[PDB]
Every structure is written in C-alpha cells, then in structure tokens.
C-alpha cells in the first residue's frame, strides 16, 4: 500500500492489471483478532418432549443387506439406473 | 496457499492436518470473522490465477 | 444466537473468470514499428 | 452435417453411422443366434439389440438418433455395439448360461463372522 | 451439498498435459465460484449430528 | 454445466494470421511474461522478519502439550486415562495411584512428542481441561530424548504457559 | 426420523435389485449371491472361475458398461477356509452406477488375473500379491509393489503382527543398513474396547 | 515529487531510533530499521512495537 | 515442597528418587533433574474449608464450563469434611 | 481334496521347477558378488543358496512349492536387475545379529525363551 504513485503506475502498467484494487497483502480490512463471544445454536434433538431416542435412532435403522439372489415371462431388460442425462454446455462461459 | 493454511489453522488449530471434518459433521464451529476473511481471500484470488 | 454468518445482503460479487486484458499493438503495427526502426537505422 | 469432433480423444468421427450401426446390430443378432433360446443372455441381448436396430432404422437424422438411442455420441454407440459383439463371441465360448459350477462353503458370504 | 452449489466442469479436447493444465486452472476458477456460493448460502445451526 | 477449455479454432484472415506471426517473430507473450515478473519486482514482498516478527496464529493452535491446574494450585488431571485411550499415536502413557491424601492422581504421565501427531484429541477428550495443547511451537531440541516428556516437564509447561493457555481457552471454550 | 437419520434411497434400491436379478440370471454359472445393502450398493458374489466372464460381461454389456475399475481389494477373514475375499469395485459412466463383485480364494488357489478386462488391475492385484499373498495366474509382471525388497510375509494378513518381525537400523561396523529382529522400547498397548452388550439387534446371529 | 517524501521518511527512520547509533543497532540486530509505536516492554527488556 | 535425598537428588511429588547405587543417575550428570516444585498436595491443603449451610453442596471447580463436571457432595458427616473428587476443595456443613 | 494347481500337476514337475530355479541362482551368484561388490566369496553365497533351498526341503504339496519357486524367481528378478541394494542381499547373512543360545542351559542363563 505504501508504494508511491510512480511505482504504483509502473507496476499497473507492467502487469496490465490494476493491482491496488486487489492487493495480496492484507491490511485493516481483515477481521479483528479479538472477537465477541459466540452463542452457538443447538441441534434439533435439544427438546424436552417428543424426543425419544428410539424415534430418531439412526444406527438401529440400518438393516442387513437384502439377499436378492442366493444359491442357498418376457421380462424387460434392465440397466443399473436410467442412463445419465447428457450434460448441457455452460450458459455462463462455454468457451464458444 | 499460506493464507488458506491460515484458514485451516483458524478453524482447527492445525495448518495442514486438521482432523476437522469428522463422521457426523465437523469438529467445531467456525470462529467469528472467518467467513469475512474467506471473502477477502476469494475477492482477490482471481487476479492471482490470472497472473499465473 | 451469535454464529459466523454472512451479512444481510450477502457478500459482494467475487470475480472468477479469466482476465487476460488484450494489451499491445496490432500485428500490422508491430511490424511497421520494427521496419521503421530498421529504416531509421539504415538511414 | 459432418460432426467435426466427437470430443472424446481417440474416438474418430464416423462418416456413415447408420449403416455401421445396422451392420453391427445384425451381426450381433447373427452371432447371438448361436446361443440357446433358454439362455437369458440371448433373450436380453436380442431384446435390446432389436430395440436399438428399430431406433436406428426409424430415424434418418443423427442428432435425434443420439437423443433417443440415449447412449451419448453416435460413435460411442458404435463402439458399444462393437463391444457387445465381442462380448457375445466370448459368451459363446464361456457358456455362462450353464448351472452353477460349485456351491460356496457354508459360511462363505456370512458377514459379520 | 454439491447439488445446491452451481459450477461448470472444464472439459479438455486433446488428452494432453496442456489441457489437463487448463482443466486444473479452470477448476481453481470454479472453486472460487463455489466458495462465493458457499459464503452466501451458509445456513445457521449445529455442526455435529445431534446423535450423541 | 460444462465448458470446453482449448476448443478455439483461430481466425485465418490476414489480420489474425499477421497477429500470430507478429507474436511469433516479435515475442509478444514473452514480453508479457517479463512484464508480469517486473510487476512483482516493484511490489512490497510478503516476507515477515522472523524471529522479530511472528506468523499469525489463532487461539485454537495445537503446539506443545501442558498439564494444567485449578486456580488453587491443584492439578486438574484425575488419572482417568481418556487421553491415552483416544491418543491415535499412543503417545500418552499414564500410571496412577491414590496419593497421600487419598486423591485420584497420576504418578506417570508421559507424552512421547515424537509419536505425537498434534491432533488435539487429548484436549478434547479431557473432561477437566487438564491436558491441553498450548501455543508453543518453538521447542526444537538437540537430542531425541528431550522430546520424551514426563509429568514434570508437562507440569512445568503448564506453569510456564498458563497465563496464555487460560486466555486461549477463554477465547475458544464456547466453540467446544 | 428426519434430521439426523440418513434418508433411504428406495428408487436406487429397487433399480439395483432388479439389475442384480438381471446379472444373476444372465450368468448363473458363476453367480452365488446377489445382495443389495440398506444404503443402496449392489454386491455380486461369484465363484472364482468366473472372474473373466463376469467382469467382461459387466465391462462390455450394453446394459452394464462398467468401463471403469474403481478399486480392487482383498480382505483377509481367517475364520473362513477361503480366507481371502477379492473385491472388485466397478463404475458405470453410462448408467451412473457402481457394482461390487466379490469372490474368494485361500492361500494356494490362484485367482485368474483381470488385466485382460481392466488394465487398471495391473498394479492392484500386484498389491494384493504383495499384501496378502494371493497369486494371480497369467499376470504380466507379478511381484512386490509396496514392501521392501527382501521382505518376508504378507503384511495385511491378520495373523501378521502390527510391527513386523524385523526392523532396520544403520550399523557402523558393516557400513550398511541391517535387518535385526524387532524389539519395541514401548510395546503397542492393545485395548480391548469391545462392549459386552449387543449394539445392533438387527444383525444378531442366530444361536447354534 | 514523491521521491523526496521517501527520502524524508528514510531520514526520519534514522532519527526515530535516536540517531545513527540506534539506527545501526537496529540495522544489524533486526535487519529492519522501520519505526513503530512502543506498545510495551516486558520485565526482560523485549520491546514490542 | 520438594525434598532432597542424601545423594543430593531432588524428590518429585510422586516420591520418585533414584537410589545411591542406581546407574540411571548418570543421565543427570552434567545436566539437571527437572522437577516441578509446586506440589499439588501442598497447594490444595492451603485452601480453606468452605463453610456452607446446606446439607448437600455442589462443586464444579469454578468457571462453569471451564472447571470439571458438577458433582454433589454430602455433608452429613460432622467428623470429616466433604471433599470434591475432582478438584479437592473441601466443604463443611456449618451446623 | 480336488484343488486347482498353480503350475505343477504333481511333485515331479514341481521338483523340475525347483531344479531350474536352483540352476538360475547358481549361475547368478558370481554376478551378484561382483556387481553388488559383496565382501563374501562365491562359494559362501552358493552355500547360502543351498541353505535357503534345504530350508524348504520338507514340503510335499505341489502348490506350496510352486509358490516357493515363484517367490524365488521374484527374489532372483530383484537381484539380477539391480532393484535390491547391497543391504538387501546381505540380509541373508545375519552378520550384526548376535549368535543365539542353542542348548537348554545357555537359554536358561539369558532368559525365559524356550
Ligand atoms: C533509482 C535510483 C535510486 C533512487 C531511489 C529510489 O528509487 O527510491 C525508491 C523510491 C520509492 O519506491 P517505492 O517502491 O514506492 O517505495 C515505497 C516505500 O514503502 C517507501 O519507503 P519506506 O517507507 O520503506 O522508507 C524507508 C526507506 C526509504 O527509501 C529510500 O530512502 C529509498 C532508497 C534511496 C537510496 O529507507 C530505507 O529503507 C533505507 C534504505 C537505505 C539504503 C537504500 C539503497 C541505497 C543504494 C546505494 C548505496 O522510488 C521512487 O520514488 C520511484 C523511482 C524514482 C526514480 C528517480 C529517478 C532515478
Ligand atoms: C546371496 C544369497 C541368495 C539367496 C537365494 C534364496 C532363494 C531361495 C529360493 C528357495 C526356493 C525353494 O525353497 S523351492 C524348494 C522346495 N522344494 C521342495 O519342497 C521339494 C523337495 N525338494 C527337494 O528335495 C530338492 O532337494 C530337490 C533338488 C528337488 C530333490 O532333492 P532330493 O532328491 O534330495
Ligand atoms: S495431540 Fe493427539 S497424538 Fe498428541 S498426545 Fe494428544 S491425542 Fe496423542
Ligand atoms: S483425559 Fe485429562 S484427566 Fe483424564 S487422564 Fe488424561 S489428562 Fe488426566
Ligand atoms: Zn470440585
């Protein structure tokens, strides 16, 4: 920031870009190193009622894998999923 | 890249190996004013890619 | 609650595209400048 | 219209994709006739090959043929028809419609142990 | 939440070192784009799963 | 949702062909690169004057370990061995017995700092804020065994750095 | 069960079950089990004589096109007499799906190498040789890839100890880094962490 | 001209260390001669700017 | 509260000191045995017993979430004070 | 008890492969002593090769000795091509290791190992 206007103009000319609007050295625009204390929010399970753990038990709703075929009509051929939709080219900047 | 390691150190305490993203979410919340400095980084980083 | 959040209007616009700003003279002009420097030197 | 590039590296642009797909699909069906009728590979591959061949014969355009064959570019549709032909020629040799060669041991796929 | 951010995916044409260089540079551009969208769309709430 | 890097066909009119030939014969992009390097010649460098200037750190920083005390002088560690149960390097070794007033305290509290991965799981596992990981990173030694800390070294680090450790915990305990 | 429970993908579960039926009835010579997990992943459990037909089918079939070998893995399970479980993770880019192909061998039966199906497999099954000892027949260059050159044993077997059997140091007498039997200054402290109470009743194995 | 301001800032950096003796003292100890606001001084003599 | 063996070696708060004939004193030869001189058993003994008027008191070590878990200490024994299991601060029912 | 072979159908083909692998090592040992510039003699390295081959002389399973020939070819390939260094070749010669107590009484004197 302390560069004189001659060096600043020379530097902007040789780069081709305005370098003072976007300086890579940080100054007083950054956040203060001393912050106010937060008050963090709690999750949706911080309730005093209707909050039984068996009604929100993630690990216990996992089941063993359903065995489709085991060794102990004119049905349609299937794929593992539908085919992937063709990507559209970028409207923002296609390089076209 | 040094400034982004400062982002990691502000969010976790380590500059590289944060152990921050964990099974269940992340370890700890963002400290106040971190997103403003991520904004100040991202606002200028395009010029860095441009001169590279 | 006091949490790390963006401001009310959101953040400002962040540039992310290439800016190679097309400086310099034309191809006709640069050869003209070089040939002019040659002719001044020759004279 | 002469597509200039496929975009995929090493995938050459096919000048006549319709005739190439017709030759590949009828050749898949010719090879696939050498498999027994109760083999599910023959039935499923005749099914999808007849569907693709009907789509190829019913659409003179190439772009709409790409949108309704639903398989990317037309040259990689040609490549997948080639791969299916090579697969059918290998499936004749393997004979994988036969019964199971061996049962596993009794607790082989039992997890956790 | 990558189905909620909005970015382009750079695609090469010749399979060489130079197109992969350009793909990495454009991925830095698009990472800046995703970071701008993440800074603007940060929600409030907890940061761990509230299954203790 | 995709873009084509390097799918530009150049213009073949005489203007653009003369542009590219002037770029070849007169080295225009090379002078562009010289100009960008010259632009960084006249910037203020990003160099800090270490050791007289220090790199910026946050109160979360994970440096040298320390065993803390209550504001009475009583040490906080009650020998519960959660920190060596969670220590992913097994750098922590703890023995314990009831001391002479019947209190649950440690006799051994070793941390091999050369096994330690400095991940702060011990300070987040500790239920009484006893083991913390302080701000000291300037503790390089000249011998390997000087980095095999026993309880006396960790209590000296706690007594040494408590004025700073307590303020960093004061700044960061509401996120924890 | 909204905020903390992972939402179940029923569409992909039904689709992968139907495709598992498809693969099981096209290839009944080798397919032993087909199972879809609760988080919608399809496993095909095959006989090891059909490594090349099942993988070549999944690579080349028009309704499969699993052109990408994501990963190739052995898992050592010592209580099974075919203790090594060779896992093939395939990726379809056409249909945007993944399939797991699993087969078995013991220490002496070789598995047929799959570099004719996926050239990605060249280093993977070489790593399986290096780490487990599973020999892959008709491999181009099968040798070690990750362990040291004089290394004895296969480290990812579960009867192999964590620290191995030998350790290195420099010895100034012979001017040479030497291998000596391993001695720890601090032993790796084994923690019996398992709870004596059952965690998941849905996974309870039936008694004898 | 703004070069004169640069030279006057250099000379007042020479002056702000108490002359040439303190200037060379900080030039050879710190390799850095710029002047600052003294925030404090601890019980050892470390001065913080 | 460090004391000293007849060999001159300091004794830690554990009670550890090397013997006169133990060879491992050679690691301190030309160097120092680092002990901490703030013994916690002596420092917590200097804290006065807190007179409270309730039958059950609670302690969390001071500081709220900066101390230890909040435990409840019974004070029915009039012979002996009630001591915190975490911080060692001791309490007496005043009646 | 019907198992898929590796290379050998029975033990005679297996001993043929053991024999060819031994021939290959015996030819290689002078080159290994030369280009690694080992401090051993050619006879000493050949005695070590014979020791390593007589170590596995009890095996009666064709698949196990097929794997022993395969791992011996891998060792040979790492030794002919200079992939091993001098240290890896000299790790067969346990030189810095102290001689272990052999009889009951010296093992009793040093410790608790049987
Ligand atoms: C060109 C020939 C040299 C002329 C001096 C020069 O270019 O000064 C840089 C001067 C300041 O440049 P800047 O990059 O904007 O510096 C901003 C600083 O933050 C502003 O400077 P500062 O805030 O850091 O102020 C302190 C600084 C002040 O800086 C100076 O005094 C500059 C050096 C003068 C010599 O003084 C020092 O650090 C002491 C340096 C002492 C040694 C300097 C080298 C001597 C070489 C010969 C022996 O450049 C100009 O004013 C533009 C060029 C002028 C050319 C004039 C025609 C020739
Ligand atoms: C420098 C040092 C270089 C060290 C080189 C180490 C390479 C070690 C390669 C080891 C390869 C083997 O162990 S294969 C040997 C296993 N063979 C068997 O178990 C079959 C039994 N073999 C025998 O009895 C052999 O003596 C013969 C020669 C096949 C037949 O002998 P019998 O008749 O009497
Ligand atoms: S920081 Fe991590 S590795 Fe180090 S002592 Fe603590 S838990 Fe162990
Ligand atoms: S977790 Fe804390 S109180 Fe428990 S043994 Fe470790 S340092 Fe001591
Ligand atoms: Zn207490």
Give DSSP secondary structure letters for chain I: ---B-TTS-B--SS-----SS-GGGGGSTTS--------HHHHTTTSPPEEESSSEEEE--SSGGGS---EEEE---SSS-EE-TTT--EEEE--
Q: Is the peptide bond before D112 cis (omega within 30 degrees of 0)?
A: yes
Residue nearest to atom 30 of ligand 2 (CA): J15
Query: What is the C-alpha radius of gyration for chain F, rounded to an integer number of angstroms?
Result: 28
Q: Do the chains G and F touch each other, judged by at least 3 C-beta pairs below 8 angstroms?
A: yes
> Chain E 4-43, CB below 8 Å of chain A: which residues?
8-9
What does G152-187 look like in DSSP terms, one character per residue? -S-TTSTTS-SS-SEEEEEETTTTEEEEEE---SS-
Verify whether ligand 4 is closer than 6 Å to residue F96 (CB atom): no
Whole-angstrom Cα distance, residue F101 to residue I42?
10
**CB-based burial label for A59 (10 Å; 0-12, 13-18, 19+):** exposed
Nearest-Cα distance to chain B for A88, in Å, is: 25
Do G179 and G150 contact (CB within 8 A), yes or no?
Answer: yes
Determination technique used: cryo-EM
Query: Residues near D60 by Cβ (< 8 Å), separated by ≥ 6?
Result: D18
| Nearest alpha-carbon partner for D98 in F152, E19, G29 | G29
**CA of residue D48 to ligand 3 center, whole Å:** 59
Ligand 2 center to D65 CA (angstroms) = 65
CA angle H10, H13, H18 (to 5 degrees): 140
The strand pair at G84-92 and G97-105 is best described as: antiparallel
DSSP-assigned states of every residue in J44-83: HHHHHHHHHHHHTTT---HHHHHHHHHHHHHHHHHHHTTT
Question: Does residue A84 sit at the F interface (CB-CB below 8 Å)?
Answer: no
Please state the separation of Cα A61 from the chain's center in Å: 28
Q: Does the beta carbon of J33 lie inside 6 Å of ligand 2? A: no
Q: What angle do CA J109, J112, J114 make, to 5 degrees?
A: 95
Going by beta carbons, is chain F in contact with chain C, meaning 3 or more pairs sit under 8 Å apart? yes
Q: Do B48 and A36 touch (CB under 8 A)?
A: no
CB of residue F85 inside a 6 A radius of ligand 3: no
Q: Does C7 touch chain A (CB under 8 A)?
A: no
Residues with CB under 6 A from ligand 1: A 2-4, 6-7; F 42; H 2-3, 6-7, 9-10, 13
- Whether residue I54 contacts residue I75, with contact meaning beta carbons closer than 8 Å, is answered with yes
The closest ligand to the CA of F126 turns out to be 4
Q: How far is G77 from chain F (nearest CA, A)?
A: 25
From chain G residues 60-119, the ones with a CB under 8 A of any chain D CB are 60-63, 65, 77, 79-82, 94, 102, 104
Gap from CA of D3 to ligand 5 centroid (Å): 80
Q: Which domain holds residue I91?
A: 1-95
Residue by residue, DSSP assigns E24-48 as: HHHHHHHHHHHHHHHHHSPPPS-SB
**CB–CB of B9 and F176 under 8 A?**
no
Q: To which residue do tokens 């992939």 refer? A: J83
Q: What are phi and psi of G167, to 5 degrees?
A: -135, 160
| Most ligand 4 atoms within 8 A of CB, residue of F65, F66, F81, F124 to mutate | F81
Angstrom resolution of this structure: 2.8
* Interatomic CA distance for residues D44 and G22, integer angstroms: 9
Q: How many domains does chain I have?
A: 1
A5 with H3: Cβ contact below 8 A: no
Contact A37, C2 (CB under 8 A): yes
- Which chains are within 8 Å of D by 3+ CB pairs? A, E, G
- Domain extent for J45: 1-114
Distance I69 CA to ligand 5 centre (A): 8
Which residue in the set E30, E39, E44 is minimally distant from C11, CB to CB?
A: E39
Range list of H helices, C1-43: 27-42
Phi then psi dihedrals of residue G179, to 5 deg: -110, 125
d(CA A59, CA A45): 16
Q: Which ligand is nearest to the CA of J80?
A: 2
DSSP 8-state assignment for residue G93? T
What backbone torsions phi and psi does residue F139 show, to the nearest 5 degrees?
Answer: -135, 40
Residues of chain E with Cβ-Cβ distance to D7 below 8 Å are 11, 13
Cβ atoms of E42 and C5 closer than 8 Å:
yes
Q: Which long-range contacts (CB under 8 A, 24 or more apart) does C22-25 make?
A: C23/A16, C23/F32, C24/F28, C24/F32
Distance from Cα G164 to the centre of ligand 1, integer Å = 63
F82 C-alpha to center of ligand 3: Å?
A: 11
| Segment holding F124, helix H or strand E | helix F121-125
Give the chain G residue nearest E51 (alpha carbons): G4
Residues with Cβ < 8 Å from J81, sequence gap 6 or more?
none
- Could you tell me which chains touch chain I, where touching means 3 or more CB pairs under 8 A? F
Per-residue DSSP letter, C2: B
Intra-chain end-to-end CA distance of chain A, in Å? 39
What count of other Cβ atoms lies within 10 Å of the Cβ of residue J100? Answer: 11
Nearest to B13 among F36, F39, F60 (CB): F60
Residue having the nearest C-alpha atom to atom 6 of ligand 4: F83
**In total, how many domains does chain J have?**
1
């Amino acid at each position: 920031a302390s560069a004189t206007r001659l060096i600043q103009g020379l530097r902007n000319w040789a780069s081709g870009r305005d370098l003072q609007a976007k300086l890579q050295l940080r100054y007083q625009e950054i956040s203060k190193r001393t912050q106010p204390p937060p008050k963090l929010p709690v999750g949706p399970s911080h309730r005093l009622s209707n909050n039984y753990y068996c009604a929100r038990d993630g690990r216990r709703e996992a089941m063993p894998p359903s065995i489709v075929m085991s060794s102990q009509s004119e049905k349609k051929a299937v794929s593992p999923a539908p085919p992937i939709k063709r990507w559209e080219l970028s409207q923002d900047e296609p390089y076209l | 890249r040094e400034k982004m390691f400062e982002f990691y150190e502000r969010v976790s305490g380590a500059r590289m190996h944060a152990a921050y993203v964990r099974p269940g979410g992340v370890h700890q919340d963002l400290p106040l004013g971190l997103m403003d400095d991520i904004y100040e980084f991202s606002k200028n980083f395009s010029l860095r890619i441009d001169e590279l | 609650v006091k949490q790390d959040m963006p401001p009310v209007g959101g953040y400002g616009p962040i540039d992310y595209k290439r800016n190679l700003p097309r400086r310099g003279l034309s191809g006709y002009s640069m050869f003209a400048v070089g040939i002019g420097a040659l002719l001044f030197g020759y004279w | 219209l002469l597509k200039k590039t496929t975009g995929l590296v090493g995938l050459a642009v096919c000048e006549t994709p319709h005739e190439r797909l017709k030759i590949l699909y009828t050749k898949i069906l010719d090879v696939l006739g050498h498999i027994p009728k109760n083999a599910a590979y023959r039935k499923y591959t005749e099914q999808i090959t007849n569907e693709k061949l009907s789509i190829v014969k019913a659409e003179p355009d190439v772009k709409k043929l790409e949108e309704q064959l639903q398989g990317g570019q037309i040259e990689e549709v040609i490549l997948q028809a080639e791969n299916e032909l090579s697969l059918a020629r290998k499936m004749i040799q393997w004979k994988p419609w036969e019964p199971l060669v061996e049962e596993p041991p009794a607790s082989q796929w039992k997890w956790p142990i | 939440v990558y189905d909620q951010v909005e970015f382009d995916v750079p695609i090469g044409s010749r399979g060489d070192c130079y197109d992969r260089y350009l793909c990495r540079v454009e991925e830095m551009r698009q990472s800046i784009r995703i970071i701008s969208q993440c800074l603007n769309k940060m929600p409030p709430g907890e940061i761990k799963v509230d299954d203790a | 949702t995709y873009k084509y890097v390097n799918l530009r066909e150049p213009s073949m009119d005489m203007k653009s062909v003369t542009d590219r030939a002037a770029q070849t014969l007169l080295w225009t992009e090379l002078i562009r690169g010289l100009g960008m390097t010259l632009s960084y010649l006249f910037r203020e460098p990003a160099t800090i004057n270490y050791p007289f200037e220090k790199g910026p750190l946050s109160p979360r920083f994970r440096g040298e370990h320390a065993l803390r005390r209550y504001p009475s002088g009583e040490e906080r560690c009650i020998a519960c061995k959660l920190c060596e149960a969670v220590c992913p390097a097994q750098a922590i070794t703890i023995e314990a017995e009831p001391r002479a007033d019947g209190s649950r305290r440690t006799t051994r509290y070793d941390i091999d700092m050369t096994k330690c991965i400095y991940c702060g799981f011990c300070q987040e596992a500790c239920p009484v804020d006893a083991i913390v990981e302080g701000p000291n990173f300037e503790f390089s030694t000249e011998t390997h065994e000087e980095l095999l800390y026993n309880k006396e070294k960790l209590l000296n680090n706690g007594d040494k750095w408590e004025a700073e450790i307590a303020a960093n915990i004061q700044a960061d305990y509401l996120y924890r | 069960t909204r905020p903390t429970v992972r939402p179940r993908n029923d569409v992909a579960h039904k689709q992968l079950s139907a495709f598992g039926e498809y693969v099981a009835e096209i290839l009944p010579k080798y397919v032993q089990q087909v199972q879809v997990s609760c988080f919608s992943e399809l496993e095909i459990c095959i006989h090891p004589d059909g490594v090349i037909p099942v993988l070549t089918f999944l690579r080349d079939h028009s309704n499969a096109q699993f052109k990408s070998l994501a990963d190739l893995t052995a898992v050592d399970i010592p209580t099974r007499q075919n203790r090594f479980e060779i896992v093939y993770n395939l990726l379809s880019l056409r249909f945007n799906s993944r399939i797991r192909v699993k087969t078995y061998t013991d220490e002496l039966t070789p598995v047929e190498s799959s570099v004719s199906v996926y050239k990605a497999a060249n280093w993977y099954e070489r790593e399986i040789w290096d780490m487990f000892g599973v020999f892959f027949a008709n491999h181009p260059d099968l040798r070690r890839i990750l362990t040291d050159y004089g290394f004895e044993g296969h480290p990812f077997r579960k009867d192999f100890p964590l620290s191995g059997y030998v350790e290195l140091r420099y010895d100034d007498e012979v001017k040479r880094v030497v291998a000596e039997p391993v001695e720890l200054a601090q032993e790796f402290r084994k923690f019996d962490l398992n709870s004596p109470w059952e965690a998941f009743p849905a996974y309870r194995q039936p008694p004898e | 001209m703004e070069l004169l301001q640069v030279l006057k800032r250099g000379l007042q950096q020479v002056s702000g260390h108490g002359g040439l003796r303190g200037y060379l003292r900080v030039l050879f100890r710190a390799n850095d001669v710029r002047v600052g606001t003294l925030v404090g001084e601890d019980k050892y003599g470390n001065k913080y700017y | 509260g460090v004391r000293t063996s007849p060999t001159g070696e300091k004794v830690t708060h554990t009670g550890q000191v090397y013997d006169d004939e133990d060879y491992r004193r050679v690691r301190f030869v030309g160097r120092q045995k680092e002990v901490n001189e703030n013994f916690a058993i002596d420092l917590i003994a200097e804290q006065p017993v807190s007179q409270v008027g309730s039958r059950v008191i609670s302690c969390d070590g001071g500081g709220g979430a900066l101390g230890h878990p909040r435990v409840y200490i019974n004070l029915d024994k009039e012979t002996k004070t009630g001591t915190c299991g975490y911080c060692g601060l001791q309490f007496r029912q005043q009646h | 008890t019907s198992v898929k072979p590796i290379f050998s159908r029975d033990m005679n083909e297996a001993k043929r492969r053991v024999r060819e692998l031994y021939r290959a090592w015996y030819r290689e040992v002078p080159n290994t002593v030369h280009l690694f510039q080992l401090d051993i003699s050619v006879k000493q390295g050949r005695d070590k090769v014979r020791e390593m081959f007589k170590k596995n002389a009890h095996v009666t399973d064709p698949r196990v000795v097929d794997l022993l020939v395969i791992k011996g070819k891998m060792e040979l390939e790492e030794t002919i091509n200079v992939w091993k260094q001098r240290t890896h070749v000299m790790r067969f010669f346990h030189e810095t290791e102290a001689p272990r107590p052999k009889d009951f009484l010296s093992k009793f004197y040093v410790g608790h190992d049987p």
